[PDB]
Design a protein around this ligand. Structure first.
Ligand SMILES: Nc1ncnc2c1ncn2[C@@H]1O[C@H](CSCC[C@H](N)C(=O)O)[C@@H](O)[C@H]1O
Ligand SMILES: Nc1ncnc2c1ncn2[C@@H]1O[C@H](CSCC[C@H](N)C(=O)O)[C@@H](O)[C@H]1O
Lengths: 71, 262, 262, 72
């Protein structure tokens, strides 16, 4: 399910022609890239797992504090 | 062996340099620090031999220093170099912009006499200028870590476009959790209110990581910042509060009259 | 028609984003402001339908309103768009960093109801951090156009990495024609001396434009800057003159002291 | 020929990390290996290619900022 989305998102972010065709008709362009009705819907509504991973904000913030707090 | 640290930009797949993409394809081993599973899947298809560096962040049941977190990451990168491997680190955005792991690894690799370099990438501020149609050179530009701006003395030039990075965790500390993030942001607003009106429009900016989503460009008065939902990927833009004024002292030296400035 | 402004970075062929390269490939027509013949040749082989905007710069001497130059560039771009062409405007580095043409063209295309956008690129800022292994986030970062710093009132934060762009033409004006350029940089040096001592080490940086050349990273005392040989591509880096000091007032509001930082 | 050969080569070299690693190992050998003449190799090795006609439009940009904030 997410393996097909991932491969379609990679092409879409690289191809300027696909980016334009997608803008004009996103539903029809996703059908033509072999994407299920579940997958189309999830993209159109925005209701789709973002797969966000642990950001290093707190580690970078803390490191900066520890660096200039040693003087 | 060798070390090349590269940025993949913020957008999935399309925002990397042709050269940086080439470095990853041909790398013996890749150490990744990417923000989501889509970009992790994309990297792995480029080069299967990927070691994911976020295993080195504190996991369930652990508390870990930034020092030990980074030391462990650098050590892992340097082990592959020590083993004679053509090693590439793949960070999101620009590997040397508001990030220290790559700088640290490159410093250590050179010290041990290996060839190590950094390839510039497209950072969050680079995305911001494009998405908000703002020129940082127009009236100048300042970037500070939001917490550094609170803990240390930074005096901003309010003629400039000011970026406060990592705005979500502004003033965060295991000893300041008696204050809510809203309470800390209220303290930051009091501080900014020294140069910026409480009704001064600021922008919460979040560059898109996927090609199917628009960036977050939320405009709101400075006073409403404490009630804003902020993400780890939020950057705060504070446009100029003041028009540029002629520098009459330096014009006088040069022999120019203000009326002769077009 | 549509408009997309892209940047090619500073390094020939390899520093352009994969997606920015594709927009050029597929464009019906490309308007270029590339600085040199090698990048012009590379663009040409990607897409033969190129119009050079460099023609619109003052040609018979030097008395043209910069607003008129840019007005004509924007007009030439919009004429291709108005004719229903997939228009792409190719700039060096980042199309929107210390440049106004792309923002102007995109503003007027939007205002005329055409699809217009800017793709971020790798700027001279971004190459500097990588080449000098400096993190703008470490103690903060400030960017000013050198001449804007002299003619207008900017306050530098000497705890930050301060970039003066277009350093070569610092103080250039029709009224300063007969100034010797060391005279102009000497005034800038005196001005900067309010915050930076004269023996303070500064860096003249020039990112490589070709893969066969290494960058210029020239360290020298601020005092010697007027004697320096400077190029249109020169950027001046002024590292911090001061350690970060604790913001005691904000620390007390948060309920922590300096001893809690570290 | 001379300029076309240098442009094609530089373009390839700027795009390929493999080629760029080899060029740092043996600059003469790699250039010689890509059909570049001794005259071309000579222009590169301790010669020109830099300090050759560039136009970065800094003057027109600094003037634009001045008159747009000149409030006159
Ligand atoms: N998608 C995004 N939109 C806006 N800012 C972002 C962002 N992703 C990261 N950032 C900024 O970067 C901080 C993390 S530090 C890493 C930044 C990265 N090296 C870069 O070049 O952008 C965040 O707290 C935020 O201020
Ligand atoms: N090769 C180079 N190395 C260092 N700075 C450079 C450079 N090329 C341009 N610059 C800087 O940029 C100024 C021109 S304004 C154009 C900047 C371009 N949009 C970018 O993203 O970089 C120069 O005066 C200098 O300050």
């Amino acid at each position: 399910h997410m393996s097909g989305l991932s491969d379609f998102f990679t092409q879409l972010g690289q191809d300027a022609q696909l980016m334009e065709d997608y803008k004009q008709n996103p539903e029809a362009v996703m059908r033509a890239h072999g994407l299920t009705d579940e997958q189309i819907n999830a993209v159109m509504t925005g209701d789709m797992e973002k797969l966000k991973t642990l950001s290093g904000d707190s580690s970078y913030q803390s490191y900066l504090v520890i660096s200039h707090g040693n003087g | 062996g060798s070390l090349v640290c590269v940025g993949t930009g913020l957008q999935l797949a399309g925002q990397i340099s042709v050269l940086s993409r080439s470095y990853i394809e041909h790398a013996d081993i890749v150490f990744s620090l990417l923000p989501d599973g889509f970009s992790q899947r994309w990297l792995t298809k480029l080069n299967p031999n990927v070691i994911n560096l976020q295993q080195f962040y504190a996991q369930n049941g652990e508390v870990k220093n930034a020092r030990d977190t980074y030391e462990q990451m650098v050590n892992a990168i340097l082990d592959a170099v020590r083993a004679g491997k053509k090693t590439v680190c793949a960070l999101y955005g620009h590997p040397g912009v508001f990030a220290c792991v790559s700088h640290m690894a490159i410093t250590r690799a050179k010290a041990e006499g290996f060839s190590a370099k950094m390839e510039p990438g497209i950072s969050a501020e680079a995305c911001l200028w494009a998405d908000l149609g703002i020129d940082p050179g127009n009236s100048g530009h300042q970037s500070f870590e939001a917490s550094q701006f609170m803990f240390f003395n930074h005096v901003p030039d309010p003629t400039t476009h000011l970026l406060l990075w990592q705005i979500a965790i502004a003033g965060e500390h295991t000893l300041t959790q008696f204050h809510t993030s809203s309470d800390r942001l209220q303290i930051l607003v009091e501080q900014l209110n020294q140069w910026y009106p409480l009704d001064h429009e600021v922008v919460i900016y979040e560059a898109a990581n996927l090609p199917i989503q628009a960036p977050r460009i939320e405009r709101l008065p400075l006073a409403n910042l404490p009630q804003a939902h902020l993400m780890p990927i939020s950057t705060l833009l504070i446009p100029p509060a003041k028009k540029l004024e002629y520098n009459y002292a330096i014009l006088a030296k040069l022999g120019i009259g203000p009326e002769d400035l077009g």
